[PDB]
Design a protein around this ligand. Sequence first.
Ligand SMILES: CCCC(=O)NCCCC[C@@H](N)C(=O)OP(=O)(O)OC[C@H]1O[C@@H](n2cnc3c(N)ncnc32)[C@H](O)[C@@H]1O
Ligand SMILES: [Mg+2]
Length: 267
Amino acid sequence: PALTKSQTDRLEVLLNPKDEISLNSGKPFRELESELLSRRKKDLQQIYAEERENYLGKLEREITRFFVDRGFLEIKSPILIPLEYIERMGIDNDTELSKQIFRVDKNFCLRPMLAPNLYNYLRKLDRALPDPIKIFEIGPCYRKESDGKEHLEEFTMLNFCQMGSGCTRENLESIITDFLNHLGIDFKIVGDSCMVYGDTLDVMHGDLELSSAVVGPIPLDREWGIDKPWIGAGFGLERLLKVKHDFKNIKRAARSESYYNGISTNL
Ligand SMILES: CCCC(=O)NCCCC[C@@H](N)C(=O)OP(=O)(O)OC[C@H]1O[C@@H](n2cnc3c(N)ncnc32)[C@H](O)[C@@H]1O
Ligand SMILES: [Mg+2]
């Protein structure tokens, strides 16, 4: 008797990318399930006995070390931010990204991106730090989404940026290139052909967007008291993990009660 679709869904929760076993080979569901539960328990036992690190926390520490070693100051800014920051980001109440925002009181929301706090740090630190100013933040962001294959409602962003001298497209591409080759993630940078000043580049892994990146200046800068050249990029940590570990579903890389380091916790 063939596996039912529900049975197949159950086994896939338990399946790992490198398991390499035939789901079409005559063996009953109960035995296939029992073999996989056994392997997944072994995986959790190995982690507990040896490393004990969460993939998301560990990616965060590896990324932090990378950017600190290259001259970028580590920022930890509020996750709960004023709603006014969203409007000041040019997201008017008509825009679709405006529908994706988790509001908290009359006045606050969960940040859907790192840019507003980074803009404020850029302006402030410009009164104290020598040119160029190099900063980054890693942390949670929130968007109400309409999909769930590559999009989470709760995700983790890395954003880095540089302001002042050296803010070129070539330098932006070089830092992105060094970063992803350090992590061992394959990519290609796509952008408009002959664009110089206000460019937007996407960093792609096949059809999956890893990052969008910007070469400033852009008109929105003046709303934040910024009047210097800059470069920057934002990367989703869960998309990076999904590519690195070859997860079929991004939920396996998220903050979760259902998966730990890509392994089902429902054993
Ligand atoms: C002052 C300095 C500002 C600065 O430095 N600006 C340039 C940075 C632009 C970036 C910034 N402005 C930005 O938001 O873009 P995004 O909405 O395309 O998200 C970027 C990445 O986050 C991930 N991502 C986005 N939404 C999701 C989601 N629902 N689930 C998982 N990952 C996601 C995904 O990897 C995506 O490519
Ligand atoms: Mg985008």
